Ligand binder design. Structure first.
Ligand SMILES: Nc1ncnc2c1ncn2[C@@H]1O[C@H](COP(=O)(O)OP(=O)(O)OP(=O)(O)O)[C@@H](O)[C@H]1O
Ligand SMILES: Nc1ncnc2c1ncn2[C@@H]1O[C@H](COP(=O)(O)OP(=O)(O)OP(=O)(O)O)[C@@H](O)[C@H]1O
Ligand SMILES: Nc1ncnc2c1ncn2[C@@H]1O[C@H](COP(=O)(O)OP(=O)(O)O)[C@@H](O)[C@H]1O
Ligand SMILES: [Mg+2]
Ligand SMILES: [Mg+2]
Ligand SMILES: [Mg+2]
Lengths: 50, 384, 50, 146, 394
C-alpha cells in the first residue's frame, strides 16, 4: 500500500495498433493520431502471438 | 548471382569443361583474396560488428515519414507524419537508389535523420483488378465458333508464345481487339479461355465502374490503370461492357455528360498516346457497338473487330453436348426437339435450361433428369 | 436468362396467411380469453405483413 | 469611378492598360480574373480586401482587373447543385468597391470581351461607371495599325 | 562420355560461389538497408560527423523583411510566425522575400535558402526522354512539316536570321484534322530532334476535383517554364480543356471555363511569357473559343488533310520497307483502291496482309495477299470508318 507513493510517479504506457511484423524482431505499430513506429518486442511476447 | 550467362554448347564438349573450370579459378582466387583480409586485419567479426554498430546508431524508436524531394548530397527535405517537415540528412547505409517522392521512409527519433526506407504495403486496388488464379476450363469448353478462336490467339496468344513468326515477316502484331454481338453469345466466355491459357498478368475492369461521383476522379482512375498494367509485365487489359459508359446516366456523377466525355478523352489517350507504350494488349467487349465513339475504334487503337453471330442450329447441338456432359442424363430425352424450341436461343439460354432442369430433380431427390424436367424447364426459363 | 439463378415472387397474404402473422405477433401481447382472431384477419382484405 | 471596356477579343484592351502603366507614375496594380478563386472558403474573399487595402495605402493608385467574366458570372437559383463559393468573392468585390464606407482614392479599370454573361449587380452605374466599347477597325485604322 | 563428371564439377563450384559469398556479407535480405560493403565510409567517421555536429534545420517560409535591420518575418506550417535573424555563413542578399529557408530548432535563425516547391504532378509531365520517330516517318505531308518546322526550331537553332532582319517570329501553332491523320505522330518527331525542355500536357489532366485547383496547375507550369531559357509546351486534346463560354441558367461547366481563362492570360498581355513556344493539337477545332483562336496565341493553323495520291504511295513505302515481300508488286495500284483513307489505316493494311502469309505457311507476302487485306480493312470495316462525320468536324 505504501509502495504506490513511490510507484505512480512512473509515467504511463501508450496504446497503439499493430499493422504487421517483419525481419529481425520488430513490429510496425501506429499510435492515436501519431505516426507509425517501428518498435521492437519485449522478451515475453511471441511474434506469432502478435 | 548472375555470375555467367553463357550456356550455349549444351553437350559433353571440352568447351563446357573449359569455361566452368576457368570460372572455378575466378571464384577461388576471389575467395583466397578476401580470406586474407580477416587473417591480417581481424579488427571486427563483420557478421555483427558492423551490424551492431549500425543497430546502435539507429535508434530503437523509429518514426515513419514521407519523401517529397531529394538533394543528392545525402540530405533531403522529408515530411514528418504530422505535417511539419524537416531538412534532415541521409546516411550511407540507406542504399540511395530506392528513394522516390512519396515513398515511406524510416527516420531517427532524435535528429530525424533518414535511416532506412520502408517496403510499401500495396495495394487495396491492385489486388482488386488483378485476376488471382485461372478462371475455368480450356478452349475445348467453347464449341462452335472455331473461326474467331483462331483470331484471338492470332493477336494475343501467338504473339506471346511464338516470337519468331512476326520477326521472319518483319512486322509488328495487331494492337487492339474488340468483341461484339448480341447478348449472351459468348463474349465474356471467350475471355476466360484466354486467362486460362496465358502466362501474362491479366487485368479486368467493367465499363460501368469507370464513372465516378467526384469531378476528375474518372480520368484519374484510367491513368493509374495503365500505370499498373505497364509496371508489371507483358500484360492483358480486358475492358468489358464499354457501351455502359455512355448509355446509362447516373445521378451520382456530379459532372453530367461532359464528365463522361473527359474520361473518354483520357481513355482515348492511353490507347494511342505519344508515350512509349510497352507490351500491353487491350481486349474490349460490348453488345451495342453502334453507340460508342468512332474515334476510339480507329485502326491504331483497335485493329481487329470480331463479330459474334447467333449460334447456328448445328452449333447449338454441340453446346448441349457440352453442358450435359457430366450429368447423369436419362435416355428418355431427345435433344433435337430442344434445339429448335426458340428460333434464336443464345448459348446462354442452353446453360440456363440445363442448370434449371437439374434443379427440378433435386426437388424430388432424383439422380437422373427425365423428359418432363425439360418440358417444364423452358416454360420456366424462356416463357415469362 | 443465364444471369439470375432463381426469382422468387412474394404475393400479398390471404386469409389463411393473415391469421398466422397475427398469431405470431399476438404472442408478446397480454391478451384476454375470447378473441376470435379469425374475425379480425378477415377485416383486413390483404394489406401486407407490415 | 470605375471604367469598363468590352468588345471583340482582338481589338486591343490590354494595349490601353499597358499604355497607362507606362504613362502615369502611380501605383499600378494588376489582377487576373481566375486569380480570385480559392479551394478553401473565404480565401478569395480575403484576397480581395487585401488588395484594396494595399491600394488604400498607396493612396494614388489604380487597380486593373482582366477577364472579369471569370468571377463576375451571373447569379442563378437552383437546388441540388451549383457553385456558390465564387459568388462570395464577387459579392465582396461589389461591397469592397462600392457601398458602405466609400472612398475616392482608387480607380478600377475592368476588361472583358463578353458582356451578357455578367451579373447586372456589377454593371449598375456606381460600381462600373463609364462602359466604353471597342469596335473593330473600320477601314482607315487598319491602314494605321499595320 | 563424362556425363556426371562435367555435371558435379559444374554444380559444386556453382554452390561454392554461394558458400563463401555468405561469408563476406551481401546476405540478410533487408527491410531497407544497404549492401554491407558499400556504406563503410560512414562506418566510424561520418557516423559521428553527419550526425553529432550536424543539426536538423526545420524548414519554413518567409513573409517579408523590413528596413534598417534584418528582423525577418517567418512562417511555418501550422505553428506561429516568428521574428528571426541570419547566421554568419550566409549573406543577407539571397534571403529575398517569399522563399523557403531552413531554420534551427532552438534560436529560430535562418541557415540556407531552399529551391521552391515544384508541385509534383507538374513534375511528372516533363518528358526527360526522347521518342524514336524521325521526320522520315511522316511522309506525305512535307509542306505541313516545313511550315511547322520553321516555327518550332529555326528560331531556336538559329536566333540570328530573324533578329538582324528585325522581325519577331510567331510563337503559337495548332495542328488539326480528322483522327488518325498524323497529328500526334508529327508531334513525336519534334520532341525527337529538339533540344530544349519539352513539357507535355494532356488536356484531360487539368480537370481537378476542387474549385480553382485546375487553374493553379496552369501557373506552376508557366512558372517553371519562365525559369528556363527556352521551353516547348505541348497541349494535346484541348477540346476537353475548353470549348466556349455559353453560360445559361444553372451554371454548368463553369469550372472548366475558369481553367480555360487562366490559360488565356498566360499567353498574352502584361509582361509576357518570353521565350516559351506552345503547340496545341485538336481533333475538332470548331468547338474552340474565339479568344483562343486569336493570333498572338495560335498564329499558325496547320491543316492535316487526307493524303492525295502521292501521299498515299509514300506511306505504303514507309510501312512496307521493313517486311519480307514479293519483289514484283506495285504499290501505286494499291493507293488507287483507298480513296479517302488515313495514314493509320494504311499501316493496318500492311500489318494485316503480313498475317495472311503467317496464316497458311509462307515467308513472303504476295500481291493477292495485299488485296485480301484491302477488302477486309477498307471495305469490310467500312461500317465504322471513323472519318466521314469528322471531316465535317462534328
Ligand atoms: N457458344 C457458346 N458455347 C458454349 N457456351 C456458351 C456459348 N455462348 C454462351 N455460352 C454460355 O453462356 C454463358 C454466358 O455467356 P457470356 O456471358 O460470355 O455471353 P456474353 O455475350 O458475354 O454476355 P453479355 O453480352 O451479357 O456480356 C457462359 O457461361 C457460357 O457457358
Ligand atoms: N502521314 C503518315 N505517315 C506515316 N504514318 C502515319 C501517317 N499518318 C498516320 N500515321 C500512323 O498513324 C498513327 C498515329 O496517328 P496519330 O495518333 O497521329 O493520329 P492523330 O492525327 O493524332 O489523331 P488522334 O488524335 O485521334 O490520334 C501512327 O501509327 C502512324 O504510323
Ligand atoms: N492599333 C492597334 N489596335 C488594335 N489592336 C492592336 C493595335 N496594335 C496592336 N494591337 C494588338 O492588339 C492586341 C491586344 O490584345 P487585346 O485585344 O487587348 O486582347 P484581349 O482584348 O483579348 O485582352 C495586342 O496583341 C496587339 O498586338
Ligand atoms: Mg457476358
Ligand atoms: Mg485580356
Ligand atoms: Mg492523336
Amino acid at each position: 500500500l505504501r509502495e504506490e507513493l513511490q510507484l505512480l510517479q512512473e509515467q504511463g504506457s501508450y496504446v497503439g495498433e499493430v499493422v504487421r511484423a517483419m525481419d529481425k524482431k520488430k513490429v510496425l505499430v501506429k499510435v492515436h493520431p501519431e505516426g507509425k513506429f517501428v518498435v521492437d518486442v519485449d522478451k515475453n511476447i511471441d511474434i506469432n502471438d502478435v | 548471382a548472375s555470375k555467367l550467362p553463357l550456356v550455349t554448347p549444351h553437350t559433353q564438349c571440352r568447351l563446357k569443361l573449359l569455361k566452368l573450370e576457368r570460372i572455378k579459378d575466378y571464384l577461388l582466387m576471389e575467395e583466397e583474396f578476401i580470406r586474407n583480409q580477416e587473417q591480417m586485419k581481424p579488427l571486427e567479426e563483420k557478421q555483427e560488428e558492423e551490424r551492431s554498430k549500425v543497430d546502435d546508431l539507429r535508434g530503437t524508436p523509429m518514426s515513419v515519414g514521407t519523401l517529397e524531394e531529394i538533394i543528392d548530397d545525402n540530405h533531403a527535405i522529408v515530411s514528418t507524419s504530422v505535417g511539419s517537415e524537416h531538412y534532415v540528412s541521409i546516411l550511407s547505409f540507406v542504399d540511395k537508389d530506392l528513394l522516390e517522392p512519396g515513398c515511406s521512409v524510416l527516420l531517427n527519433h532524435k535528429v530525424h535523420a533518414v535511416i532506412g526506407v520502408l517496403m510499401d504495403d500495396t495495394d487495396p486496388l491492385v489486388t482488386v483488378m488483378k485476376v488471382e488464379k485461372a478462371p475455368q476450363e480450356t478452349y475445348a469448353d467453347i464449341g462452335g465458333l472455331d473461326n474467331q478462336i483462331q483470331e484471338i490467339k492470332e493477336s494475343v496468344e501467338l504473339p506471346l508464345t511464338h516470337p519468331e513468326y512476326y520477326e521472319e515477316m518483319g512486322i509488328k502484331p495487331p494492337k487492339g481487339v474488340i468483341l461484339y454481338g448480341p447478348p449472351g453469345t459468348g463474349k465474356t466466355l471467350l475471355a476466360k479461355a484466354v486467362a486460362n491459357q496465358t502466362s501474362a498478368t491479366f487485368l479486368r475492369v467493367v465499363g460501368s465502374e469507370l464513372i465516378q461521383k467526384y469531378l476528375g476522379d474518372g480520368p484519374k482512375l484510367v491513368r493509374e490503370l495503365f500505370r499498373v498494367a505497364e509496371e508489371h509485365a507483358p500484360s492483358i487489359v480486358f475492358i468489358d461492357e464499354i457501351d455502359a459508359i455512355g448509355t446509362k446516366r447516373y445521378d451520382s456523377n456530379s459532372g453530367g455528360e461532359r464528365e463522361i466525355q473527359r474520361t473518354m478523352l483520357e481513355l482515348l489517350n492511353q490507347l494511342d498516346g505519344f508515350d512509349s507504350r510497352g507490351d500491353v494488349k487491350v481486349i474490349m467487349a460490348t453488345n451495342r457497338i453502334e453507340t460508342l465513339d468512332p474515334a476510339l475504334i480507329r485502326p491504331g487503337r483497335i485493329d481487329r473487330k470480331i463479330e459474334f453471330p447467333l449460334p447456328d442450329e448445328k452449333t447449338k447441338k454441340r453446346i448441349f453436348q457440352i453442358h450435359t456432359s457430366r450429368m447423369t442424363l436419362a435416355d428418355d430425352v431427345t435433344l433435337d426437339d430442344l434445339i429448335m424450341a426458340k428460333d434464336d436461343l443464345s448459348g446462354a439460354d442452353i446453360k440456363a435450361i440445363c442448370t434449371e432442369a437439374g434443379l427440378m430433380a433435386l426437388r424430388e431427390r432424383r439422380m437422373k433428369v427425365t423428359n418432363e424436367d425439360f418440358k417444364k424447364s423452358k416454360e420456366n426459363v424462356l416463357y415469362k | 436468362p443465364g444471369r439470375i439463378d432463381r426469382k422468387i415472387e412474394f404475393p400479398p397474404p390471404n386469409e389463411e396467411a393473415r391469421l398466422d402473422i397475427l398469431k405470431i405477433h399476438s404472442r408478446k401481447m397480454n391478451l384476454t380469453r375470447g378473441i376470435n382472431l379469425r374475425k379480425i384477419a378477415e377485416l383486413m382484405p390483404g394489406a401486407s405483413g407490415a | 469611378k470605375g471604367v469598363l471596356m468590352y468588345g471583340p477579343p482582338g481589338t486591343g484592351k490590354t494595349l490601353l492598360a499597358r499604355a497607362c502603366a507606362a504613362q502615369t507614375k502611380a501605383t499600378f496594380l494588376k489582377l487576373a480574373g481566375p486569380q480570385l478563386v480559392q479551394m478553401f472558403i473565404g480565401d478569395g474573399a480575403k484576397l480581395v480586401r487585401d488588395a484594396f487595402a494595399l491600394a488604400k495605402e498607396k493612396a494614388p493608385s489604380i487597380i486593373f482587373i482582366d477577364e472579369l467574366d471569370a468571377i463576375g458570372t451571373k447569379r442563378f437559383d437552383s437546388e441540388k447543385a451549383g457553385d456558390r463559393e465564387v459568388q462570395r468573392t464577387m459579392l465582396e468585390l461589389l461591397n469592397q468597391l462600392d457601398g458602405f464606407q466609400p472612398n475616392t482614392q482608387v480607380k478600377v479599370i475592368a476588361a472583358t470581351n463578353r458582356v451578357d454573361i455578367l451579373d447586372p449587380a456589377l454593371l449598375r452605374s456606381g460600381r462600373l461607371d463609364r462602359k466604353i466599347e471597342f469596335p473593330m477597325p473600320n477601314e482607315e485604322a487598319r491602314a494605321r495599325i499595320m | 562420355t563424362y556425363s556426371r563428371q562435367i555435371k558435379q564439377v559444374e554444380d559444386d563450384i556453382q554452390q561454392l560461389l554461394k558458400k563463401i559469398n555468405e561469408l563476406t556479407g551481401i546476405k540478410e535480405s533487408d527491410t531497407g538497408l544497404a549492401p554491407p560493403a558499400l556504406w563503410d565510409l560512414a562506418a566510424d567517421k561520418q557516423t559521428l560527423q553527419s550526425e553529432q555536429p550536424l543539426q536538423v534545420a526545420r524548414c519554413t517560409k518567409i513573409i517579408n523583411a523590413d528596413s534598417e535591420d534584418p528582423k525577418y518575418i517567418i512562417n511555418v506550417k501550422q505553428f506561429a510566425k516568428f521574428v528571426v535573424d541570419l547566421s554568419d555563413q550566409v549573406a543577407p542578399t539571397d534571403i529575398e522575400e517569399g522563399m523557403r529557408v531552413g531554420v534551427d530548432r532552438n534560436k529560430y535563425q535562418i541557415h540556407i535558402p531552399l529551391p521552391p516547391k515544384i508541385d509534383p504532378t507538374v513534375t511528372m509531365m516533363q518528358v526527360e526522354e526522347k521518342p524514336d520517330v524521325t521526320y522520315s516517318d511522316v511522309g506525305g505531308c512535307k509542306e505541313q512539316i516545313e511550315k511547322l518546322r520553321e516555327v518550332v526550331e529555326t528560331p531556336l537553332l538559329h536566333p540570328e536570321r530573324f533578329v538582324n532582319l528585325g522581325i519577331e517570329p510567331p510563337k503559337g501553332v495548332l495542328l488539326f484534322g480528322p483522327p488518325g491523320t498524323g497529328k500526334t505522330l508529327c508531334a513525336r518527331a519534334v520532341a525527337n530532334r529538339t533540344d530544349a525542355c519539352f513539357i507535355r500536357v494532356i488536356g484531360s489532366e487539368l480537370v481537378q476535383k476542387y474549385v480553382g485547383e485546375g487553374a493553379r496547375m496552369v501557373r506552376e507550369l508557366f512558372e517553371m517554364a519562365r525559369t528556363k531559357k527556352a521551353c516547348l509546351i505541348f497541349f494535346d486534346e484541348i477540346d476537353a480543356i475548353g470549348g466556349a463560354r455559353f453560360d445559361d441558367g444553372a451554371g454548368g461547366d463553369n469550372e472548366v471555363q475558369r481553367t480555360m481563362l487562366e490559360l488565356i492570360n498566360q499567353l498574352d498581355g502584361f509582361d509576357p511569357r518570353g521565350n516559351i513556344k506552345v503547340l496545341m493539337a485538336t481533333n475538332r477545332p470548331d468547338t474552340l473559343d474565339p479568344a483562343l483562336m486569336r493570333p498572338g496565341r495560335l498564329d499558325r493553323k496547320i491543316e492535316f488533310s487526307l493524303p492525295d495520291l502521292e501521299g498515299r504511295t509514300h506511306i505504303f513505302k514507309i510501312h512496307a520497307r521493313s517486311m519480307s515481300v514479293e519483289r514484283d508488286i506495285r504499290f501505286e495500284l494499291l493507293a488507287r483502291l483507298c480513296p479517302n483513307s488515313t495514314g493509320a489505316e494504311i499501316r493496318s493494311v500492311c500489318t494485316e496482309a503480313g498475317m495472311f502469309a503467317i496464316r497458311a505457311r509462307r515467308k513472303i507476302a504476295t500481291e493477292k495477299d495485299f488485296l485480301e487485306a484491302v477488302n477486309k480493312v477498307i471495305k469490310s470495316y467500312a461500317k465504322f470508318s471513323a472519318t466521314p462525320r469528322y471531316m465535317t468536324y462534328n
